[PDB]
Design an enzyme around this catalytic site. Structure first.
Site, PDB file in Angstrom:
ATOM      1  N   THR A 154      85.161  78.425  40.636  1.00 22.06           N
ATOM      2  CA  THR A 154      85.472  77.899  39.283  1.00 22.06           C
ATOM      3  C   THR A 154      86.930  77.443  39.164  1.00 22.06           C
ATOM      4  OG1 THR A 154      83.816  79.336  38.354  1.00 22.06           O
ATOM      5  CG2 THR A 154      85.416  78.420  36.804  1.00 22.06           C
TER       6      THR A 154
ATOM      7  N   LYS B 295      97.889  85.590  35.677  1.00 18.58           N
ATOM      8  CA  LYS B 295      97.081  84.407  35.280  1.00 18.58           C
ATOM      9  C   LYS B 295      97.953  83.396  34.524  1.00 18.58           C
ATOM     10  CE  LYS B 295      93.727  82.474  32.319  1.00 18.58           C
ATOM     11  NZ  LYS B 295      93.093  82.558  30.982  1.00 18.58           N
TER      12      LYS B 295
ATOM     13  N   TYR C 132      91.816  81.695  26.353  1.00 16.25           N
ATOM     14  CA  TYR C 132      90.420  81.839  26.820  1.00 16.25           C
ATOM     15  C   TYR C 132      89.789  83.053  26.142  1.00 16.25           C
ATOM     16  CZ  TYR C 132      86.154  82.338  29.423  1.00 16.25           C
ATOM     17  OH  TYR C 132      84.836  82.481  29.759  1.00 16.25           O
TER      18      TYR C 132
ATOM     19  N   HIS D 125      74.190  83.490  38.193  1.00 16.14           N
ATOM     20  CA  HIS D 125      74.585  84.783  38.819  1.00 16.14           C
ATOM     21  C   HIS D 125      73.565  85.863  38.446  1.00 16.14           C
ATOM     22  CE1 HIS D 125      78.310  83.540  40.555  1.00 16.14           C
ATOM     23  NE2 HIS D 125      78.774  83.080  39.379  1.00 16.14           N
TER      24      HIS D 125
ATOM     25  N   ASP E 136      81.817  72.301  38.190  1.00 15.94           N
ATOM     26  CA  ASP E 136      82.804  72.727  39.210  1.00 15.94           C
ATOM     27  C   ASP E 136      82.107  72.877  40.562  1.00 15.94           C
ATOM     28  OD1 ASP E 136      81.348  74.793  38.090  1.00 15.94           O
ATOM     29  OD2 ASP E 136      83.063  76.149  37.861  1.00 15.94           O
ATOM     30  N   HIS E 137      80.851  73.317  40.570  1.00 14.95           N
ATOM     31  CA  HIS E 137      80.130  73.714  41.807  1.00 14.95           C
ATOM     32  C   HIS E 137      78.672  74.025  41.480  1.00 14.95           C
ATOM     33  CE1 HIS E 137      80.117  77.705  40.197  1.00 14.95           C
ATOM     34  NE2 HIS E 137      81.427  77.580  39.968  1.00 14.95           N
TER      35      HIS E 137
ATOM     36  N   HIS F 102      78.039  81.354  44.624  1.00 10.87           N
ATOM     37  CA  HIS F 102      78.601  80.074  45.118  1.00 10.87           C
ATOM     38  C   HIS F 102      79.887  80.379  45.884  1.00 10.87           C
ATOM     39  CE1 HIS F 102      81.222  80.390  41.589  1.00 10.87           C
ATOM     40  NE2 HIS F 102      80.115  80.821  40.981  1.00 10.87           N
TER      41      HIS F 102
ATOM     42  N   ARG G 141      98.032  65.977  57.825  1.00  7.14           N
ATOM     43  CA  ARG G 141      98.898  64.772  57.952  1.00  7.14           C
ATOM     44  C   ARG G 141      99.462  64.689  59.377  1.00  7.14           C
ATOM     45  NH1 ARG G 141      98.497  62.398  53.125  1.00  7.14           N
ATOM     46  NH2 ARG G 141      99.000  60.559  54.390  1.00  7.14           N
TER      47      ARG G 141
ATOM     48  N   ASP H  73     102.170  64.421  62.174  1.00  6.70           N
ATOM     49  CA  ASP H  73     103.571  64.904  62.317  1.00  6.70           C
ATOM     50  C   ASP H  73     104.473  63.690  62.569  1.00  6.70           C
ATOM     51  OD1 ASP H  73     102.990  68.014  62.479  1.00  6.70           O
ATOM     52  OD2 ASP H  73     101.849  67.178  64.161  1.00  6.70           O
TER      53      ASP H  73
HETATM   54  C1  LIG Z   1      97.641  65.766  48.973  1.00  6.65           C
HETATM   55  O1  LIG Z   1      98.591  65.135  48.140  1.00  6.65           O
HETATM   56  C2  LIG Z   1      99.680  65.977  47.968  1.00  6.65           C
HETATM   57  C3  LIG Z   1     100.465  65.382  46.820  1.00  6.65           C
HETATM   58  O2  LIG Z   1     101.047  64.148  47.261  1.00  6.65           O
HETATM   59  C4  LIG Z   1     100.418  66.068  49.309  1.00  6.65           C
HETATM   60  O3  LIG Z   1     101.318  67.176  49.203  1.00  6.65           O
HETATM   61  C5  LIG Z   1     102.719  66.963  49.399  1.00  6.65           C
HETATM   62  O4  LIG Z   1     103.065  67.039  50.757  1.00  6.65           O
HETATM   63  C6  LIG Z   1     104.408  66.641  50.983  1.00  6.65           C
HETATM   64  C7  LIG Z   1     104.609  66.740  52.494  1.00  6.65           C
HETATM   65  O5  LIG Z   1     104.671  68.126  52.870  1.00  6.65           O
HETATM   66  C8  LIG Z   1     105.365  67.540  50.184  1.00  6.65           C
HETATM   67  O6  LIG Z   1     106.636  66.885  50.079  1.00  6.65           O
HETATM   68  C9  LIG Z   1     107.659  67.696  50.695  1.00  6.65           C
HETATM   69  O7  LIG Z   1     108.146  67.162  51.925  1.00  6.65           O
HETATM   70  C10 LIG Z   1     109.237  67.944  52.428  1.00  6.65           C
HETATM   71  C11 LIG Z   1     109.189  67.964  53.948  1.00  6.65           C
HETATM   72  O8  LIG Z   1     110.362  67.310  54.437  1.00  6.65           O
HETATM   73  C12 LIG Z   1     109.199  69.349  51.819  1.00  6.65           C
HETATM   74  O9  LIG Z   1     110.145  70.194  52.450  1.00  6.65           O
HETATM   75  C13 LIG Z   1     109.512  69.240  50.335  1.00  6.65           C
HETATM   76  O10 LIG Z   1     108.978  70.370  49.641  1.00  6.65           O
HETATM   77  C14 LIG Z   1     108.881  67.951  49.812  1.00  6.65           C
HETATM   78  O11 LIG Z   1     108.544  68.088  48.433  1.00  6.65           O
HETATM   79  C15 LIG Z   1     104.924  67.911  48.768  1.00  6.65           C
HETATM   80  O12 LIG Z   1     105.512  69.175  48.413  1.00  6.65           O
HETATM   81  C16 LIG Z   1     103.428  68.073  48.661  1.00  6.65           C
HETATM   82  N1  LIG Z   1     102.974  68.204  47.283  1.00  6.65           N
HETATM   83  C17 LIG Z   1     102.138  69.205  46.918  1.00  6.65           C
HETATM   84  C18 LIG Z   1     101.676  69.139  45.505  1.00  6.65           C
HETATM   85  O13 LIG Z   1     101.734  70.106  47.656  1.00  6.65           O
HETATM   86  C19 LIG Z   1      99.479  66.406  50.469  1.00  6.65           C
HETATM   87  O14 LIG Z   1     100.128  66.121  51.699  1.00  6.65           O
HETATM   88  C20 LIG Z   1      98.169  65.650  50.399  1.00  6.65           C
HETATM   89  N2  LIG Z   1      97.233  66.215  51.342  1.00  6.65           N
HETATM   90  C21 LIG Z   1      96.644  65.498  52.299  1.00  6.65           C
HETATM   91  C22 LIG Z   1      95.815  66.267  53.296  1.00  6.65           C
HETATM   92  O15 LIG Z   1      96.781  64.295  52.398  1.00  6.65           O
HETATM   93  N1  LIG Z   2      90.195  79.047  31.480  1.00  8.80           N
HETATM   94  C1  LIG Z   2      89.719  80.278  31.885  1.00  8.80           C
HETATM   95  N2  LIG Z   2      90.516  81.348  31.860  1.00  8.80           N
HETATM   96  C2  LIG Z   2      90.078  82.529  32.240  1.00  8.80           C
HETATM   97  N3  LIG Z   2      88.815  82.693  32.667  1.00  8.80           N
HETATM   98  C3  LIG Z   2      87.946  81.648  32.719  1.00  8.80           C
HETATM   99  C4  LIG Z   2      88.378  80.410  32.328  1.00  8.80           C
HETATM  100  N4  LIG Z   2      87.322  79.568  32.482  1.00  8.80           N
HETATM  101  C5  LIG Z   2      86.299  80.267  32.946  1.00  8.80           C
HETATM  102  N5  LIG Z   2      86.645  81.538  33.101  1.00  8.80           N
HETATM  103  C6  LIG Z   2      85.818  82.594  33.573  1.00  8.80           C
HETATM  104  O1  LIG Z   2      86.089  82.827  35.172  1.00  8.80           O
HETATM  105  C7  LIG Z   2      84.982  83.208  35.664  1.00  8.80           C
HETATM  106  C8  LIG Z   2      84.874  82.732  37.173  1.00  8.80           C
HETATM  107  O2  LIG Z   2      83.535  82.171  37.373  1.00  8.80           O
HETATM  108  P1  LIG Z   2      82.752  82.531  38.782  1.00  8.80           P
HETATM  109  O3  LIG Z   2      82.555  83.985  38.888  1.00  8.80           O
HETATM  110  O4  LIG Z   2      81.386  81.832  38.788  1.00  8.80           O
HETATM  111  S1  LIG Z   2      83.846  81.910  40.272  1.00  8.80           S
HETATM  112  C9  LIG Z   2      83.868  82.497  34.771  1.00  8.80           C
HETATM  113  O5  LIG Z   2      82.780  83.294  34.644  1.00  8.80           O
HETATM  114  C10 LIG Z   2      84.521  82.274  33.427  1.00  8.80           C
HETATM  115  O6  LIG Z   2      83.867  83.164  32.343  1.00  8.80           O
HETATM  116 ZN   LIG Z   3      82.183  78.117  38.186  1.00 11.57          ZN
END
Ligand SMILES: *[C@@H]1O[C@H](CO)[C@@H](O[C@@H]2O[C@H](CO)[C@@H](O[C@H]3O[C@H](CO)[C@@H](O)[C@H](O)[C@@H]3O)[C@H](O)[C@H]2NC(C)=O)[C@H](O)[C@H]1NC(C)=O
Ligand SMILES: Nc1ncnc2c1ncn2[C@@H]1O[C@H](COP(O)(O)=S)[C@@H](O)[C@H]1O
Ligand SMILES: [Zn+2]
Ligand SMILES: *[C@@H]1O[C@H](CO)[C@@H](O[C@@H]2O[C@H](CO)[C@@H](O)[C@H](O)[C@H]2NC(C)=O)[C@H](O)[C@H]1NC(C)=O
Ligand SMILES: *[C@@H]1O[C@H](CO)[C@@H](O)[C@H](O)[C@H]1NC(C)=O
Ligand SMILES: *[C@@H]1O[C@H](CO)[C@@H](O)[C@H](O)[C@H]1NC(C)=O
Ligand SMILES: *[C@H]1O[C@H](CO)[C@@H](O)[C@H](O)[C@H]1NC(C)=O
Length: 816
Positions: A153, A192, A237, A277, A320-321, A432, A703, A705
């Site tokens: 979820t 949370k 919630y 469930h 979600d699933h 799930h 990604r 290198d």
């Molecule tokens: C999914 O998209 C994500 C969002 O663009 C991306 O995550 C980003 O990855 C880059 C590369 O690691 C991070 O940028 C960072 O790069 C330097 C390395 O020199 C870090 O030291 C710094 O923290 C810099 O910000 C981002 O932090 C990162 N963002 C998130 C939200 O995680 C992913 O790469 C994408 N995934 C795939 C598999 O494509």
């Molecule tokens: N925004 C939220 N904040 C806290 N709990 C949530 C929120 N949305 C849904 N939940 C609850 O988390 C539980 C996780 O669902 P699961 O057990 O199927 S993975 C759900 O049953 C739901 O009842």
């Molecule tokens: Zn769910």
């Protein structure tokens, strides 16, 4: 009149049947006492008993004649009491121009989630679900929306509104441990609400920075201060709030004045997950739960119609699933293999993970590999598989984050895992969390509104693509995310973003022939193979000859390199083309085409290499470097077994420029692919374009290198610096229509793999027949986009199709 409570609830009477609370005990209530006098305190609907009711003070909504004037009629008032049609009763009408009030020049989007609504529920019970069935009929539908792993979820909801994989957005489960924070995440805990957990940018934050307000009635992260921002309206919630009240509140928000009225809305219901469930996905309780949520969607649509917003609002109905039936006979207990040990914490379920209990001290130092080897191939047809997170299939994108325990378990459909029977819930419940390609984990998606097409059934897409789509519907610039912007343009009436193929940064270098001495490479070549006696002659090709070669081997254009500081050169041959890296002494990619009636030789070609005079000779390009080498061997990208002209061995494929370092264990997979499988694929599809190459993902971040990072990852073997690939990628391309061959396709049919390059085959449990290789290939299939990200390459840039249609093709994952 005399025999009815209508107009006289709670008034005392002499004339027979009674309408006061005392009547019940005495059993002399009028027949309609409950329906007229009591029910209205507990229901949100009008019915034939309530039409023209005397207004009751305690009723939740009114069905009195004056209800329209006081503006508090039950939503179904017009349909039941004035004989007007409900939203569901009206035939589909196309929405080409939106009909919106001032303030909605950009129409609102509402993201409506039905927790645990598996796609199959609509496939099978559509006839019991008229409202959702009509949204499908009038709108834009997919039979299956693929969730993110693990199929839970919080990860999937937060993925939908960020377009990020859980490994990047940081919400990998409902229970996590972060070692750097030395804190645990729980939905019952105050953690949370800790912003440290929630990475990326939810669409309500994106919207706020670009001046749109948001109204969330429950969504993971909407009650958390993310980048210092809450939604303009959000709810703490409370699962106890009746579904009707959530829908009525969102309908109030849509009537706010335009200065404070949101553009982005969310609605979340716990059904049918809760019933799934408690009673299992195939149960009376789930049918009743599905009918209830169908009615709640209908209540929203009737409400929007009353407000004249039903041809204005963009509705995305989503889940979600999915949901699977659990069984106590399909649960694995690790204490069977490890004993009742007290040093490990095991996250139970189908997405099982293992962690030392002594954290954060032993979190990195702990012997994961020990337990991995301990739990591998212990039984025949074992229903779980231990994996170090970086050895999981790349399509799961489940490794980068430190919140992902270094040891994960991959479980077969319907199977779960725990340490022992004490540390789980009831094994026989619905569950799930399994692999996000399993049928029963697939999710709901229906798009309805002015922004969406009508009566369209789109092919399967991933929920990470939805963030970009919602940004388009709101005319927002999307934050960086893992969606491919434009891949879902086919869902929209009027796409706002036209994607372009990415630009190659440095233009291709040339590798010219250089006269140099015929050297000994230390090879004991098979006599059969006709060597290359005049290289300068055999590789001096006419413009005419090259055009023929290019047309046969690069029918979609050459892969383009998007890496920043990298120097690749094109190498031509009669059967294949390749892009060679001088920096890593290896091709980044080969391209060739196997035709239906081509021959594969069984003739030995081990310990045979011919010198390529287009590059300087290097110790690692010599048979002698590999001769009785215990640490690494070599393999060919373009297969020497494939001959067009002769029935022998294609000699040009033995060039030093067409070899990559390769473990002896991986040679089994590679040999079986080129000898057996590639032949079968060529036959079945009437020819196959193949592009294969190495993959370097030492950071296990999905990604490629940087060249800089690669210079530090080379190993020393026989006093030479060699770079050993983490994976090998393959991309097969035929036509949808098997009448045509791969050089003349109207529509491409693709199949791609990111095969892990491992020193043993412990993953495949080799004991009993190389049928296990096919299973390994299927498990490690990938989107072309996954390959593009991890190689730094970009394919099909010379297909005539529009770019968005190519992005659709590249984001596709196949099913079998
Ligand atoms: C999914 O998209 C994500 C969002 O663009 C991306 O995550 C980003 O990855 C880059 C590369 O690691 C991070 O940028 C960072 O790069 C330097 C390395 O020199 C870090 O030291 C710094 O923290 C810099 O910000 C981002 O932090 C990162 N963002 C998130 C939200 O995680 C992913 O790469 C994408 N995934 C795939 C598999 O494509
Ligand atoms: N925004 C939220 N904040 C806290 N709990 C949530 C929120 N949305 C849904 N939940 C609850 O988390 C539980 C996780 O669902 P699961 O057990 O199927 S993975 C759900 O049953 C739901 O009842
Ligand atoms: Zn769910
Ligand atoms: C959570 O929501 C429920 C239902 O909306 C709230 O419970 C109600 O509380 C009122 C008065 O506080 C009672 O008169 C009702 O009988 C309750 N309804 C039910 C069905 O239990 C509860 O107050 C909410 N908790 C909060 C604000 O978080
Ligand atoms: C980590 O958290 C545990 C659990 O409360 C605590 O005992 C300990 O002080 C914390 N700090 C470190 C770094 O061990
Ligand atoms: C695995 O190690 C456990 C200790 O946790 C032990 O009980 C068991 O004998 C080992 N199993 C083997 C050697 O596969
Ligand atoms: C390596 O040498 C030959 C290569 O043909 C091979 O047959 C033999 O098994 C190997 N020898 C050793 C010492 O491993």
């Amino acid at each position: 009149e005399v025999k009815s409570c209508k107009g006289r609830c709670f008034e005392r009477t002499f004339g027979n049947c009674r309408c006061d609370a005392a009547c019940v005990e005495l059993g002399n209530c009028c027949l309609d006492y409950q329906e007229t006098c009591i029910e209205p305190e507990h229901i949100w609907t009008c019915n034939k008993f309530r039409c023209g009711e005397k207004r009751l003070t305690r009723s939740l909504c009114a069905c009195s004649d004056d209800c329209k004037d006081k503006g508090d009629c039950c939503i179904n008032y017009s349909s039941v009491c004035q004989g007007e049609k409900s939203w569901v009763e009206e035939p589909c009408e196309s929405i080409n121009e939106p009909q919106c009030p001032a303030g909605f020049e950009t129409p609102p989007t509402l993201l409506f989630s039905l927790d645990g609504f598996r796609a199959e529920y609509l496939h099978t019970w559509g006839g019991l679900l008229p409202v959702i069935s009509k949204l499908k009929k009038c709108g834009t539908y997919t039979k299956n929306m693929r969730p993110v792993y693990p199929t839970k979820t919080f990860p999937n909801h937060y993925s939908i509104v960020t377009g990020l994989y859980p490994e990047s957005h940081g919400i990998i489960d409902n229970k996590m441990y972060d070692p750097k924070m030395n804190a645990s995440f729980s939905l019952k805990s105050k953690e949370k609400f800790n912003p440290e957990w929630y990475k990326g940018e939810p669409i309500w934050v994106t919207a706020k920075y670009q001046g749109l307000k948001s109204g969330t009635f429950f969504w993971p992260g909407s009650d958390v201060e993310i980048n210092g921002i809450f939604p303009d309206i959000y709810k703490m919630y409370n699962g106890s709030v009746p579904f009707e009240e959530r829908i009525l509140a969102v309908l109030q928000w849509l009537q706010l004045p335009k200065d404070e009225r949101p553009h982005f809305y969310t609605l979340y219901l716990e059904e049918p997950d809760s019933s799934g469930h408690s009673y299992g996905p195939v149960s009376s309780e789930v049918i009743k739960a599905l009918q209830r949520v169908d009615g709640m969607v209908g209540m929203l649509m009737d409400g929007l119609k009353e407000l004249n917003l039903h041809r204005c609002l963009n509705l995305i109905l989503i889940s979600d699933h999915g949901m699977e039936q659990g069984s106590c006979k399909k649960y694995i207990y690790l204490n069977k293999y490890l004993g009742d040990v007290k040093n490990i914490k095991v996250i139970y379920g189908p997405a099982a993970r293992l962690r030392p209990s002594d954290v954060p001290d032993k979190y990195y130092s702990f012997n994961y590999e020990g337990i991995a080897r301990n739990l591998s191939c212990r039984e025949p047809n074992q229903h779980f598989k231990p994996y170090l997170k970086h050895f999981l299939p790349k399509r799961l994108h489940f490794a980068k984050s430190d919140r992902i325990e270094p040891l994960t378990f991959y479980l077969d459909p319907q199977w779960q895992l725990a340490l022992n029977p004490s540390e789980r819930k009831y094994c026989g419940s619905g569950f799930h969390g399994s692999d996000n390609v399993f049928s029963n984990m697939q999710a709901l998606f229906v798009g309805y509104g002015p922004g969406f097409k009508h009566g369209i059934e789109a092919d399967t897409f991933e929920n990470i693509e939805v963030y970009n789509l919602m940004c388009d519907l709101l005319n927002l610039t999307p934050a960086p995310n893992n969606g491919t912007h434009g891949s879902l343009n086919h869902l929209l009436k009027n796409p706002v973003y036209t994607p372009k193929h990415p630009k190659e940064v440095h233009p291709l270098v040339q590798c010219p022939f250089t006269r140099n001495p015929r050297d000994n490479l230390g090879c004991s070549c098979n006599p059969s193979i006709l060597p290359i006696e005049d290289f300068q002659t055999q590789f001096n090709l006419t413009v005419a000859e090259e055009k023929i070669i290019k047309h046969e081997t690069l029918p979609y254009g050459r892969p383009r390199v998007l890496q920043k500081e990298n120097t690749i050169c094109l190498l031509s041959q009669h059967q294949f083309m390749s892009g060679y890296s001088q920096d890593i002494l290896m091709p980044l990619w080969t391209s060739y085409t196997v035709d239906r009636n081509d021959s594969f030789s069984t003739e030995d070609f081990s310990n045979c290499l011919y010198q390529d005079f287009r590059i300087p000779l290097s110790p690692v390009h010599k048979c002698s470097f590999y001769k009785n080498n215990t640490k690494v061997s070599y393999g060919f990208l373009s297969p020497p077994q494939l001959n067009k002209n002769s029935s022998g061995i294609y000699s040009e494929a033995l060039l030093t420029t067409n070899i990559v370092p390769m473990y002896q264990s991986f040679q089994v997979i590679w040999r079986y692919f080129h000898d057996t499988l590639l032949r079968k694929y060529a036959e079945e599809r009437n020819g196959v374009n193949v592009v294969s190459g190495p993959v370097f993902d030492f950071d296990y971040d999905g990604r490629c290198d940087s060249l800089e990072n690669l210079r530090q990852k080379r190993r020393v073997i026989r006093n030479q610096e060699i770079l050993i690939p983490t994976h090998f990628f393959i991309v097969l391309t035929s036509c949808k229509d098997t009448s045509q061959t791969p050089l003349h396709c109207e529509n491409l049919d693709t199949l791609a793999f990111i095969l892990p390059h491992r020193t043993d085959n412990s993953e495949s449990c080799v004991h009993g027949d190389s049928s296990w290789v096919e299973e390994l290939l299927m498990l490690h299939r990938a989107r072309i986009t996954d390959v593009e990200h991890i190689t730094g390459l970009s394919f099909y840039q010379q297909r005539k199709e529009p770019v968005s249609d190519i992005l659709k093709l590249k984001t596709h994952l196949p099913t079998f």
